[PDB]
């Protein structure tokens, strides 16, 4: 039996990505940036390929690499450039064109897909593998019954009993 998110339109998205002839499209390095038509100094900047960790404030795991095959979780991020305050109002000003484009719009299923996008666009990239969660609990409090075990204070000595 096979049932891996088999009740939604994502079935019709996984295929249409493996249609023959279109599943083997490939370009040389930096070639997609030449035909993109954006200024060429944009590709002198550095990019980071990484999957963001779970927020500490909440316990849910949906925006992590646990659901990597279900949901795109890998991101492309750029270093910050200068910001200052507006003299009249105090609003935060910037001259960065890539200020929100990687964090809002570019999401990928795997690390290699984001690498392929960076390679064909000409961005130099560094890849950061996320830290793997550990599921095995401690030896103490491994199960619920270890809360009430004999490991709290040892086996009780029967020396204060009447008739000792």
């Amino acid at each position: 039996e096979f049932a891996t998110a088999s009740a939604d339109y994502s079935i019709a998205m996984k295929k249409a990505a493996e249609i023959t002839g279109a599943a083997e499209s490939a370009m040389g390095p930096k070639e997609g940036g030449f035909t993109a038509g954006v200024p060429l100094d944009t590709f002198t900047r550095k990019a980071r390929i990484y999957a963001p960790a779970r927020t500490a404030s909440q316990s849910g795991l949906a925006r992590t690499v646990d659901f990597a095959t279900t949901t795109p979780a890998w991101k492309i991020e750029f270093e910050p450039t200068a910001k200052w305050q507006n003299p009249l109002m105090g609003w935060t000003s910037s001259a960065d064109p890539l200020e929100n484009v990687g964090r809002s719009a570019l999401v990928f299923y795997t690390k290699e897909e984001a690498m392929r996008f960076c390679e064909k666009l000409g961005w130099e990239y560094e890849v950061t593998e996320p830290n793997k969660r550990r599921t095995q609990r401690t030896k103490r409090y491994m199960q619920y019954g270890d809360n009430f075990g004999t490991k709290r204070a040892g086996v009780p000595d029967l020396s204060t009993l009447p008739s000792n």
């Binding site: 949906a62 969660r133 599921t135 491994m142 619920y144 809360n147």
Partner: protein
């Protein structure tokens, strides 16, 4: 080893888990993220919030998946009508005494109670009684 990884069934899917794992860990190894409020990975198990209630075959009651150990050949169901009714009822009990404080609360936007109410709870309430009020503490 005497089969140190045991096989369970979560929604008719076979899952291999280490021995001593709970039902919640078997659900997590099947790619299902069970709602929870009192369970934590780093703390001891408590079992008092009743949000992690799933259905196990040949058990007439909902079990608390965080505390219940996983046995060999166990069949776990996480999407039956009794599981959804249990989740909505436990959420409704969690919200009757809670203060209408989301505008002034700092967890608003990253709240487990808000998001779990949006996903696993109902959209209405039927409670019109007075709530419990508690004084704050200095820590």
């Amino acid at each position: 080893p005497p089969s140190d990884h045991l096989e369970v069934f979560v929604n008719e899917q076979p899952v291999k888990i280490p021995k001593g794992s709970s039902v919640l860990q078997a659900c997590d190894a099947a790619g299902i993220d069970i709602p929870r409020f009192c369970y934590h990975q780093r703390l001891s198990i408590a079992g008092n919030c009743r949000m992690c209630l799933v259905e196990v075959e040949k058990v007439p009651k909902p079990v608390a998946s965080c505390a219940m150990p996983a046995g060999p050949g166990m069949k776990i169901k996480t999407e039956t009508p009794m599981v959804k009714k249990a989740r909505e009822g436990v959420m409704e009990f969690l919200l009757i005494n809670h203060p209408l404080d989301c505008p002034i609360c700092d967890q608003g936007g990253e709240c487990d109670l808000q998001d779990q109410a949006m996903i696993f709870g109902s959209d209405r309430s039927r409670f019109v009684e007075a709530k419990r009020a508690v004084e704050d503490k200095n820590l």
